[PDB]
Design a protein around this ligand. Structure first.
Ligand SMILES: COc1ccc2c(c1)c(CC(=O)O)c(C)n2C(=O)c1ccc(Cl)cc1
Ligand SMILES: COc1ccc2c(c1)c(CC(=O)O)c(C)n2C(=O)c1ccc(Cl)cc1
Ligand SMILES: [Cl-]
Ligand SMILES: [Cl-]
Lengths: 274, 274
């Protein structure tokens, strides 16, 4: 089973898949996609990243959605059922938006296709299973929306963010320089609207701290991770979404004003502990 | 187990739930909602219909999404697991649209929460289970979109449709008269755009026939219903969506130019056969 992960290193969706693969010590190769030309992903009809293709000898499968990849690869690690069958339980559901745009959502993306036996093996109980599902959805439907407005909240921050994005990502020496200044500007302004459209406060930092606190309270103090002893897909989902800001002011503030570090560091070492 | 179904009689979403309850000969009461004031539904935070509340003695549960109601009530009929636990597997997933609107989708809405045993009891095999799921989604993501443009396609048709909607539904003698002419007009124009936004052909009837044919070919000629011997959630989904046009020109045309009647009539008697 050879895993190749096509990604945008600094993207919360790719970090999410990495947090999962790393935690389960799964071996994979990563091909960094060029956000401007995206030639490395032009083999797929699915036009979003991450994309993960699993090769099993002569056979191979393309897992598209970041939440679907984790769900499919996970039910696979527990059930051992063929990946080509498992990916069949998370179908791409096409529909035309109320604006005429063709959206594609993936069915059952936060549900592991597990039987009673294996389910009892990975979950605390029925309520633990539906809880991570709810928090998996929160991570990318609410939490990720707090990244941009926060890392591009100030012109200085916007430049630091794109410096890190271009340095961390794949850009030609030329488009790198352009994207560094041009992209920081566009994103600084563009995020001013993302902040509004998503109904964020004026002090976006406060929206970040609230979510952070809302999370640690959810984890509670009776357990190290929402998953209990070890982190579960929900712990790894929030971790993966937040790690993306590591090194930026947003992250330092997060750690300094929220009491989220203990859990964060906990999920980190649980990962480095392969 | 007392079932109360709040609905809009002539709506495909309510017809879908009725087609299911009827087919399983489930006893329920229906309270017709006034589309204008909707007072009869103002007990629910969920602001869409159908809504189905199941009362079990002193306890009661509100099942909101038309596909979720069918999925939950169904897994319940097979597993016997408490409804209050079952509805827990189809969570409301909130998110803010790219336009700033708060949309709510229901997780795993087309997946019955069944174990190996019961699943083998209700499905032909693994491929039969994911096939109805795919056709359940088609019914409401593609098929329903062909109803309005087709039944409001012409001014004469628009009036006949609203005559039937007001006669079939719950409107005050006054607002009924208004809605009959005012609503027919609004819908005739409004559907002119629905036809465009949804990328429908100019001859919307053709879109209807194609879908119809696409369905009968899917069912094939080796089985009476997509579900084999008896109809399954996919057969009942398409039937429920189409019945809504019964009596209108659109429906007569459908039956006359598509070879869909045989299956349609087959699902009808399978239902009347309680
Ligand atoms: C190279 O491509 C990127 C990089 C970062 C991205 C995205 C795409 C998308 C979009 C997508 O997945 O296509 C989101 C939401 N990103 C961020 O959250 C983000 C993270 C850290 C910093 Cl410093 C600044 C921004
Ligand atoms: C009273 O309320 C109604 C009635 C009909 C409706 C809807 C709501 C919705 C919307 C909803 O569920 O809120 C859709 C999509 N309807 C139709 O398909 C339709 C069916 C038959 C005819 Cl003749 C004309 C139109
Ligand atoms: Cl593209
Ligand atoms: Cl500023």
């Amino acid at each position: 089973l050879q895993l190749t992960l096509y990604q945008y290193k600094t993207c919360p969706f790719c970090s999410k898949v990495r947090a999962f693969l790393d935690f389960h010590a799964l071996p994979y190769q990563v091909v960094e996609v060029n956000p401007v030309l995206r030639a490395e992903i032009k083999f797929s009809s699915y036009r979003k990243v991450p994309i993960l293709v699993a090769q099993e000898g002569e056979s191979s499968q393309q897992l598209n959605d970041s939440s679907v990849i984790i769900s499919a690869l996970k039910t696979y690690l527990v059930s051992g059922q063929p990946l080509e069958e498992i990916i069949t339980y998370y179908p791409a559901m096409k529909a035309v938006n109320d604006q005429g745009k063709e959206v594609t959502e993936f069915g059952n993306k936060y549900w592991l296709m597990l039987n009673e036996k294996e389910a009892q093996q990975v979950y605390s109980g029925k309520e633990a299973r539906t809880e991570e599902m709810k928090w998996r959805q929160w991570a990318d439907d609410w939490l990720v929306h707090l990244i941009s407005p926060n890392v591009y909240r100030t012109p200085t921050e916007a430049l630091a963010s794109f410096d890190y994005i271009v340095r961390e990502g794949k850009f030609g020496a030329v488009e790198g320089a352009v994207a560094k200044y041009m992209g920081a500007a566009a994103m600084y302004l563009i995020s001013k609207r993302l902040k509004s459209r998503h109904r964020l406060q004026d002090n976006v930092r406060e929206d970040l701290y609230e979510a952070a606190d809302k999370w640690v309270a959810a984890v509670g103090k009776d357990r190290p991770f929402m998953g209990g002893q070890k982190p579960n897909l929900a712990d790894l989902a929030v971790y993966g979404v937040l790690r993306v800001m590591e090194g930026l002011d947003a992250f330092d503030d997060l750690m300094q004003h929220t009491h989220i570090q203990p859990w964060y560091l906990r999920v980190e070492r649980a990962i480095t502990e392969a």
